[PDB]
Design a binder for this molecule. Structure first.
Ligand code: HEB
Length: 218
């Protein structure tokens, strides 16, 4: 199965990849694509000819249409990804921006106790040097996930509860960047055996400029 979510599905949408083009696009992987179109896989975008790799993040254009980009991050070595897409010049104007995660949930199991910490990074209008970073604390007995990540401008924190059977987590979120606080929502999933990684999104209806994708490894 494939688990994922996207903050705005008007233009892009996520799920299992659907396009087979020898040597570039492969079906059956974690993927993204035009709303109304077919999904391609991140595995083929990462390290491809349109990929621009900076500080652990992939930024890829499209062969097909200029002036829109995906910045995304792989969780460990799993087929699990989080990032954003936008239209515009690049690093510059983030029009119609949307944040997402999607992963293959094959083999995912969730502990029933006790505690673990995750290295987390986040994506919000990424331009090379501004990835978010920090730690999440999971308590598998209490079924809680909480933590925060930040860059120099923005801080996002999550407070979520864990559904161990589906490996989902769901709760609130808070953004600070900068001086002012905005309350929002958090959602995502654990991925991999023993919840080896996680990915999710933090969204803020009152200011979508704050919406942030995040993920990392235990
Ligand atoms: C980057 C790099 C790249 C490259 C090289 C490519 C190359 C290619 N490709 Fe691609 N794609 C892509 C990137 C890409 N691509 C993307 C990103 C997508 C999604 C959408 C957009 O545009 O964004 C796709 C998508 C896609 C699709 C789907 C569409 C719809 O909407 O439905 C198809 C069919 C294809 C094909 C193809 C081909 C045939 C080729 C060659 C030959 N593609």
């Amino acid at each position: 199965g494939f688990d994922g979510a996207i903050s705005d599905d008007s233009l892009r949408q996520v799920g299992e990849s659907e396009v087979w083009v020898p040597f570039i696009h492969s079906k059956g992987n974690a993927g993204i694509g035009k709303t109304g179109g077919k999904r391609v896989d991140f595995e083929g975008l990462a390290g491809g000819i349109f990929d621009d790799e900076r500080n652990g993040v992939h930024t890829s254009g499209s062969k097909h249409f200029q002036d829109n980009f995906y910045s995304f991050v792989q969780v460990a070595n799993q087929d699990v990804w989080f990032g954003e897409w936008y239209e515009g010049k690049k690093d510059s104007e983030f029009n119609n921006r949307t944040v997402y995660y999607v992963g293959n949930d094959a083999g995912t199991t969730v502990p029933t106790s006790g505690k673990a910490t995750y290295n987390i990074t986040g994506i919000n209008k990424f331009s090379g040097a501004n990835k978010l970073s920090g730690t999440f604390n999971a308590d598998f007995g209490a079924k809680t996930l909480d933590g925060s990540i930040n860059n120099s401008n923005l801080t996002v924190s999550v407070d979520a509860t864990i559904n161990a059977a589906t490996a989902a987590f769901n709760g609130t979120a808070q953004a600070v960047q900068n001086g002012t606080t905005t309350n929002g929502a958090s959602q995502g999933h654990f991925f991999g055996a023993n919840a080896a990684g996680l990915a999710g999104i933090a969204t803020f209806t009152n200011n979508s400029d704050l919406d942030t994708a995040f993920g990392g490894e235990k």
